[PDB]
From a paper:
Here, we describe the production and validation of a discovery library that produces single-domain nanobodies using an engineered human antibody variable gene segment. Our structures reveal that these nanobodies adopt a VHH fold as expected.
Twenty-one nanobodies binned to the Class 2, CC6.30-compete epitope (referred to as Nb-C2) and 24 nanobodies to the Class 4, CR3022-compete epitope (referred to as Nb-C4). These structures use the same tyrosines (as YY in the YYDRxG motif) to form hydrophobic and π–π interaction with highly conserved residues in the SARS-CoV-2 RBD. Meanwhile, similar hydrogen bonds and salt bridges are used to maintain these β-bulge structures. Another unexpected finding with the class 4 nanobodies 225, 240, and 255 was their convergent mode of binding. The YYDRxG-like motif ([YY(D/T/S)xxG]) in the CDRH3 found in these three nanobodies was also identified in several antibodies isolated from different convalescent COVID donors. Neither of these biases can explain the convergence observed with the class 4 nanobodies, as the constant VHH region does not make significant contacts with RBD and the CDRH3 diversity was randomly generated using mixed trimer phosphoramidites during oligonucleotide synthesis. We also note that there are additional nanobody sequences that bin with the CR3022 site that contain a YYDRxG-like motif. These data would suggest that the convergent binding solutions are more attributed to the geometric compatibility of this epitope, i.e., the formation of the backbone hydrogen–bonding network and aromatic packing, than to the presence of starting antibody gene segments. Nb-C2-121-Nb4-Ig, Nb-C4-225-Nb4-Ig, Nb-C4-240-Nb4-Ig, and Nb-246-C4-Nb4-Ig did not neutralize at concentrations of 100 µg/mL.
Numbering used by the authors:
A (entry chain B): 1 to 52, 52A, 53 to 82, 82A, 82B, 82C, 83 to 100, 100A, ...
B (entry chain L): 1 to 95, 95A, 95B, 96 to 213
C (entry chain H): 1 to 82, 82A, 82B, 82C, 83 to 100, 100A, 101 to 129, 132 to 214
D (entry chain A): 334 to 527
The structure:
């Protein structure tokens, strides 16, 4: 886990479509599931999506389900979050990192992030 | 988080005295405590680890005790080279690897000495630059605790003064203070009387030194 | 024998980068926990980062994502790369060997890192003249104002006058420049006979000033 | 033939983390309800399998690894973690399929003068491979000079004891940890749910 750069866009109109991209190096991208973490201005960080190495299992939060789609191309070691039906509440900064999932005692699934960081800045979406 | 506190902040003692300084923790840390000594301009020196075990090459007068939330460092006989700042450090903490204490400074005790107070008006050369600095000098006082009040036309001033205190002197073990009141030239010409009032143990009443602009 | 020798400190603009190095003798950096601890001017000691024997690296929250700890084993040297400095990192940094519950035994001499957007400026020397008000003691001095960076050196009568001289620690102002005062207490009978000059040297600006303080 | 989970979970004396105990569950019927219907576990995290489906699955073998660590170190018992426990005492594989369960043990493993029978490996040159057990008591060499089996400067004993006192904070307080690992091989399946 040597680095993780991010891209995708900035200011964008409501009800629009845009995709956010993340790059990876120093590890087998297909081996580790990657996740998108969104941090709102003045609010806490929130897990929006997580995708397995295969992509056969994709997990999304209820706050954004039905609108964003998370995809990965293991060929280029890149992470994609396609954002559609945009609303002003989705205005935040997005970050990528390696992620792992666990089941609690009652069967619900939560996600844990490998300790690292990706540096980027967004001001409107 | 576990917070480390150290008391006293300042302690005055003489050579041969027995010195005890305490370090407290918000939550019990068992014996995960270390004691270090630092002198001005030099790196910290490890004195005690595990809160009771002496580091090799450290004199036996240093001793540590305590478990849980309260720990103590004791010097059986204070020696002239033992005058320094002492820190306590938590070991195997989370999230930080270790957390140091605020620090305790051990200083040379002596008789109470009243300060000598002098006031210095701004120089005309500085007045040409557009800024005026008035200086108050407190010379050769003990104990260190002293208060300086800057007054302009009998009005107490806050937010325009900066202070500096020298270390204990090599000969008479006396501290000295220098306070600067910085203002604009226009404000300096707008007022006439500038005074510095010093409060100290050696003074029965606070001592005020004043000057009037333009003599 | 045992010694950690540091280098790489200096003056940096905010947002800049600096690499600190710590060469080791008497211990192997690989086989030891190696930590960086910084002391801010006039404050206590704060842990920065730690590197393990197995390669695990841990950083403090204040410097997460900006500082990187590394080691070279051919040179037995510990390295700290500091990027995006933010002027609260201005401190004296030390490299130490960590023994966990046994504490940090071996420290280094420390290197000073100062982060400031201020420009190197020559000091202005002004006279703190003695007051007209005696037969006893009078106080005179010099104010060395608006200089960057530290340090400066102040002497009296080219070193002939060292008794009663107090050169106070400098203070950092809102402008980012330092101010200092040097005072001396002299017999007042010598005010009209002996001529007192303060000699101030600021090497970074190549400034040398001799200011005569005379009663006004 | 009920699987002996209680032998690991409800045992009086646990093991040190540097010498973590492993028990092989085989040829028995396992009811995981006793584990996932209990309220005595501070940490219950299953990676790669949900507890609810566990009673409906068959495995070739099961492994129960028990040890005692500090609370602040319980986070290290997880895939892709770094730390003294993870690097030198007990390493979980990144592709870990199993359940980590942990409960407080201040009532049993904390003594007024301190329990010094629980130890962790403090010094080790290289990080531990997954499911490795280092029980060496060799003196660690921190410098060029050989130790010759004598403790001294740059020559330290590899194991250090936890100070487990009842007045310690929760992070410094002891926690008992059991890790269940389920293995399926090209062999007859012996561990099955009800
Ligand atoms: C341990 O004993 C308690 C008390 O009877 C019981 O509730 C629990 O199920 C036991 N644990 C196991 C793993 O059997």
């Amino acid at each position: 886990e040597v680095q993780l750069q991010e891209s995708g866009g900035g200011l964008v109109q409501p009800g629009g479509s845009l995709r956010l991209s993340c790059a990876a190096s120093g590890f087998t991208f297909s081996s580790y599931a990657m996740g998108w973490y969104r941090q709102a201005p003045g609010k806490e960080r929130e897990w929006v999506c997580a995708i397995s190495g295969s992509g056969g299992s994709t997990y999304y939060a209820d706050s954004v389900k039905g609108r964003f789609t998370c995809s990965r191309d293991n060929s280029k070691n890149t992470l994609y979050l396609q954002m559609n039906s945009l609303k002003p509440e989705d205005t935040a900064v997005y970050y990528c990192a390696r992620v792992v999932s666990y089941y609690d005692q009652t069967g619900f699934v939560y996600w844990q992030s490998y300790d690292y960081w990706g540096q980027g800045t967004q001001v409107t979406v | 988080d576990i917070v480390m506190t150290q008391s006293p902040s300042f302690l005055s003692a003489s050579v041969g005295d027995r010195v005890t300084i305490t370090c407290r923790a918000s939550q019990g840390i068992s014996s995960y405590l270390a004691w270090y000594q630092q002198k001005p301009g030099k790196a910290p020196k490890l004195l005690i680890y595990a809160a009771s075990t002496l580091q090799s090459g450290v004199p036996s007068r240093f001793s540590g005790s305590g478990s849980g939330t309260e720990f103590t460092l004791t010097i059986s006989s204070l020696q002239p080279e033992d005058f320094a700042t002492y820190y306590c450090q938590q070991l195997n903490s989370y999230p930080p690897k270790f957390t140091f204490g605020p620090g305790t400074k051990v200083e040379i005790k002596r008789t109470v000495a009243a300060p000598s107070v002098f006031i210095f008006p701004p120089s005309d050369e500085q007045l040409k630059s557009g800024t005026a600095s008035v200086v108050c000098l407190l010379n050769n006082f003990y104990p260190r605790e002293a208060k300086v009040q800057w007054k302009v036309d009998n009005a107490l001033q806050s937010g325009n003064s900066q202070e500096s205190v020298t270390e204990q002197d090599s000969k008479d073990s006396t501290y000295s203070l220098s306070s600067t009141l910085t203002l604009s030239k226009a404000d300096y010409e707008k007022h006439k009387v500038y005074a510095c009032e010093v409060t100290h143990q050696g003074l029965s009443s606070p001592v005020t030194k004043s000057f009037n602009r333009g003599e | 024998e045992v010694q950690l020798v540091e280098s790489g400190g200096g003056l940096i603009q905010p947002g800049g980068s600096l690499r600190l190095s710590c060469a080791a003798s008497g211990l192997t950096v690989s086989s030891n926990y190696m930590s960086w601890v910084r002391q801010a001017p006039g404050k206590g000691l704060e842990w920065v980062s730690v590197i393990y024997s197995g390669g695990s690296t841990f950083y403090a929250d204040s410097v997460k994502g900006r500082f990187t700890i590394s080691r070279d084993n051919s040179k037995n040297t510990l390295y700290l790369q500091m990027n995006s400095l933010r002027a609260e990192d201005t401190a004296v940094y030390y490299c130490a060997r960590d023994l966990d519950v046994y504490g940090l035994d071996v420290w280094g001499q420390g290197t000073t890192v100062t982060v400031s957007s201020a420009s190197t400026k020559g000091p202005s020397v002004f006279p703190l003249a003695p007051s007209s008000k005696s037969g006893g003691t009078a106080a005179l001095g010099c104010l060395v104002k608006d200089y960057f960076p530290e340090p400066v050196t102040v002497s009296w009568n080219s070193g002939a006058l060292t008794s009663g001289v107090h050169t106070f620690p400098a203070v950092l102002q809102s402008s980012g420049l330092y101010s200092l005062s040097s005072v001396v207490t002299v017999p007042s009978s010598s005010l009209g006979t002996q001529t007192y000059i303060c000699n101030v040297n600021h090497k970074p600006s190549n400034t040398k000033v001799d200011k005569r303080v005379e009663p006004k | 033939n009920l699987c002996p989970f209680g032998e690991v979970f409800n045992a009086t004396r646990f093991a040190s983390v540097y010498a973590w105990n492993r028990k092989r569950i085989s040829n028995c019927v396992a009811d995981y309800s006793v584990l996932y219907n209990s309220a005595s576990f501070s940490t219950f995290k299953c990676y790669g399998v949900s507890p609810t489906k566990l009673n409906d699955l068959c495995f070739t073998n099961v492994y129960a690894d028990s040890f005692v660590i500090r609370g602040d170190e319980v986070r290290q018992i997880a895939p892709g973690q770094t730390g003294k426990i993870a690097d030198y005492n007990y390493k979980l594989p990144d592709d870990f399929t199993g359940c980590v369960i942990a409960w407080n043990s201040n009532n049993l493993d904390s003594k007024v003068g301190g329990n010094y029978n629980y130890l962790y490996r403090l010094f080790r040159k290289s990080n531990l491979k997954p499911f490795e057990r280092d029980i060496s008591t060799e003196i660690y060499q921190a410098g060029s000079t050989p130790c010759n089996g004598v403790e001294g400067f740059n020559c330290y004993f590899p194991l250090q004891s936890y100070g487990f006192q009842p007045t310690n904070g929760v992070g410094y307080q002891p926690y008992r940890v059991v890790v269940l690992s389920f293995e399926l091989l090209h062999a007859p399946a012996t561990v099955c749910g009800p």
